[PDB]
Design an enzyme around this catalytic site. Sequence first.
Site, mmCIF file in Angstrom:
data_model
loop_
_atom_site.group_PDB
_atom_site.id
_atom_site.type_symbol
_atom_site.label_atom_id
_atom_site.label_comp_id
_atom_site.label_asym_id
_atom_site.label_seq_id
_atom_site.Cartn_x
_atom_site.Cartn_y
_atom_site.Cartn_z
ATOM 1 N N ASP A 1 46.512 52.269 33.097
ATOM 2 C CA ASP A 1 46.476 51.801 34.477
ATOM 3 C C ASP A 1 45.041 51.676 34.978
ATOM 4 O OD1 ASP A 1 46.961 51.235 37.144
ATOM 5 O OD2 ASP A 1 47.658 53.270 37.657
ATOM 6 N N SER B 1 37.451 36.561 43.166
ATOM 7 C CA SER B 1 37.843 35.277 42.592
ATOM 8 C C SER B 1 37.266 34.138 43.428
ATOM 9 C CB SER B 1 39.371 35.188 42.509
ATOM 10 O OG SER B 1 39.776 33.879 42.174
#
Length: 330
Positions: free
Chosen positions: A35, A199
Amino acid sequence: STGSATTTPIDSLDDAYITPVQIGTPAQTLNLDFDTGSSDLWVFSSETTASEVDGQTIYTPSKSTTAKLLSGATWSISYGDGSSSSGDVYTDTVSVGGLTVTGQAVESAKKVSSSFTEDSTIDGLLGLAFSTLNTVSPTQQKTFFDNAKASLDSPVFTADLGYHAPGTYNFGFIDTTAYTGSITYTAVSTKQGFWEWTSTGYAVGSGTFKSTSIDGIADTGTTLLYLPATVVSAYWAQVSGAKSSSSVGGYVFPCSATLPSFTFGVGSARIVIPGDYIDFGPISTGSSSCFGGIQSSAGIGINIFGDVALKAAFVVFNGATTPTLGFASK
């Protein structure tokens, strides 16, 4: 040193991925959920409330010659989906894909929430976010990656998740045969403890690319892709009959639909998520309403590039003094 381990979807929807991990002496092999959005290595154990164990493989410290109680140390964690676990702590030898760390904090669960009990395939979590998020008190502990770092050929690990198929986590090297073209690297903020990046925008299907900054985290422990409501609305508007359902808890679409791809930007590069990756199947057995793999982050407080996004790429988690993230097509 290096390590290399295969990671395998737990079910037919790629809801999560498990990776075998050797703990203790002789080895006890547990299948853990790696994770990158948390920083605790915790396991089902001989100490876990018996009623809260249902099929998991447990770590038994009393059977390990290298286990030592970390006296006084406790842990307690809550995740974004509302699940939780807590317990005490041992140090022991931990190996992933041939890479060995001695003195790793192994957090032994005394209590786990229902979600963990009900998932018989996940024996615990192995956190790969930054050690600043580790919940051990009163002495915070380091992640497996942090402990391994100095011994690694290169201070990196890579995530190569499969779509309905096994993939690979590598430690200490970049497999140049595992991706196509070049890797595009992008800046990381560690201020919140996550692999947090920006992004450069998105496209829906064959649509034009929208240049826009989207701050989010690269999180292998989250199933879906969670983005701002504007983005998610633009995607689902291209699917006939799709709608946000408050009863179901997100966007659903007719199972008869063909989903468009979703593109996200990494610097000047583009990662394309095929439409099939965004299908998470009937909301209930036999339903003709299907659950979407792109959902709104509104009310999470952060955008999450989860497995839906990451499995479309070869992803480099660069833990050099100045961390960065790299993305390649594959």
